[PDB]
Amino acid sequence: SVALVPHVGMGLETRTETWMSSEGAWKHAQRIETWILRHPGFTIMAAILAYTIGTTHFQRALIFILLTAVAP
Amino acid sequence: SVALVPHVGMGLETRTETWMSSEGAWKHAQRIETWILRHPGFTIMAAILAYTIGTTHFQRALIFILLTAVAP
Amino acid sequence: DVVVLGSQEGAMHTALTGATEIQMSSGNLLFTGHLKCRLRMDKLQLKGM
Amino acid sequence: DVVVLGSQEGAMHTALTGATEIQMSSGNLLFTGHLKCRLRMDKLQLKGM
Numbered sequence: 462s463v464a465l466v467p468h469v470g471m472g473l474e475t476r477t478e479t480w481m482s483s484e485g486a487w488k489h490a491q492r493i494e495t496w497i498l499r500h501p502g503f504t505i506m507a508a509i510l511a512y513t514i515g516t517t518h519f520q521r522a523l524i525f526i527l528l529t530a531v532a533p
Numbered sequence: 534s535v536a537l538v539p540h541v542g543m544g545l546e547t548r549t550e551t552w553m554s555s556e557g558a559w560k561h562a563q564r565i566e567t568w569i570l571r572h573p574g575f576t577i578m579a580a581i582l583a584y585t586i587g588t589t590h591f592q593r594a595l596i597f598i599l600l601t602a603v604a605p
Numbered sequence: 606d607v608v609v610l611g612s613q614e615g616a617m618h619t620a621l622t623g624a625t626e627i628q629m630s631s632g633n634l635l636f637t638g639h640l641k642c643r644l645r646m647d648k649l650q651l652k653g654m
Numbered sequence: 655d656v657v658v659l660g661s662q663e664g665a666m667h668t669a670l671t672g673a674t675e676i677q678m679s680s681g682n683l684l685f686t687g688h689l690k691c692r693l694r695m696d697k698l699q700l701k702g703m
């Protein structure tokens with residue numbers, strides 16, 4: 462809805478503290494960890510698919526962290 | 534905020550309709566579509582970085598659509 | 606300085622997608638879901654026999 | 655049936671994460687930004703020589 466597309470990377474930065482920094486600076490990193498520790502089986506199975514799709518370890522960790530990131 | 538975690542994969546879905554079936558089934562794809570049409574160069578750079586990693590076509594396309602879908 | 610942070614009514618009506626509405630105004634009347642029924646029909650007449 | 659969605663105020667306050675707050679309750683006074691200013695100080699003596 463309107464509470465998505467949150468007007469983040471659009472230039473316009475200054476020295477002044479914005480509307481939400483230190484509140485919105487870490488909201489995704491908290492809701493992802495909450496979502497992982499209340500939905501673990503998709504992270505195990507995403508580690509299985511990421512270990513399957515990918516030859517070197519860098520793209521395995523990359524596909525793991527992107528597949529973990531795309532889920533809400 | 535609370536407008537995230539949108540109660541999607543929770544089980545509990547019956548034959549009855551939910552609160553925003555057919556108005557929440559496509560808001561994610563419309564949001565990503567208008568985001569790409571407002572921000573093309575990250576999708577060009579996502580194509581470039583998706584191409585140099587991924588020594589086969591499948592994980593190039595996979596890392597491309599995941600890197601597209603992570604950024605709002 | 607401190608500020609209040611608005612109303613999350615329409616923000617949470619966005620959050621309640623995928624969650625089936627019930628009717629709690631007078632009684633907690635649900636209108637979703639199912640139940641399993643074992644149906645024994647040993648004592649049915651036919652009304653026309 | 656047709657229902658309204660509700661107050662979008664707090665969701666709008668979530669939408670503005672990354673918008674620099676100004677005030678316009680009186681005037682339109684910004685308190686952000688900058689300007690490149692060429693300072694030209696020719697006739698600037700010392701007051702005390």
